[PDB]
Design a protein around this ligand. Sequence first.
Ligand SMILES: Nc1ncnc2c1ncn2[C@@H]1O[C@H](CSCC[C@H](N)C(=O)O)[C@@H](O)[C@H]1O
Length: 236
Amino acid sequence: SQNFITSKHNIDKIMTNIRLNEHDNIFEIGSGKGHFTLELVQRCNFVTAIEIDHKLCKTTENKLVDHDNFQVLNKDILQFKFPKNQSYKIFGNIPYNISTDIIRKIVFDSIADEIYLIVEYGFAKRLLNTKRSLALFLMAEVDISILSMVPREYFHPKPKVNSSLIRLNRKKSRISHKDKQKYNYFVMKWVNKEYKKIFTKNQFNNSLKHAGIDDLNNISFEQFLSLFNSYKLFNK
Ligand SMILES: Nc1ncnc2c1ncn2[C@@H]1O[C@H](CSCC[C@H](N)C(=O)O)[C@@H](O)[C@H]1O
């Protein structure tokens, strides 16, 4: 959909939590009518706006008349190819219907070291939930933080639920590239509670004890990595 945040007053509040600096190159997902894009070119070194809506690219361009450090590409973020030998960060007020696809695309198919996104409130909560697959796959590559709540009244058309500003920070991957397959399988089996397909009854117990997991309905990412580790040990 297209839910713009156009109040200068609200834009400043949100920018308050976004610590991007003058030397960062930025890729914005969905510049829309250019409201955040205008603040990013003033705050950052350079900004590449990726907008699917051909018209909005023009509108974005008109709003950025007095600025030079940017460009607006009329592409689909889902098919975009990010730099591989460059330092850059990402910002984006994104559509809910493809948030998953967008986050997977920018976390697994880009090397942005820091990502700022405005997403649906509930969506943001699921991202921190170790009971869901997406959360576990993402936590192996980035640290996730919910920075603030963005009231639905800040948007127009006004969505049904509130949104959240989240921050994703790249870190040294906790899963080696050679364990991608085995980690993928493990994650899926664990979130579906198909314990018997990855742990014998005794292996299961020892692993939880070893990981220090008292509540099987409340585990930290660290406790999960412990499990994935024991899983490997039991099948090397
Ligand atoms: N797959 C995709 N690739 C690039 N842009 C997309 C996209 N799907 C939606 N968009 C664009 O992302 C925006 C979502 S709303 C964000 C509007 C803007 N940041 C503002 O508040 O002014 C729209 O401009 C929409 O056209």
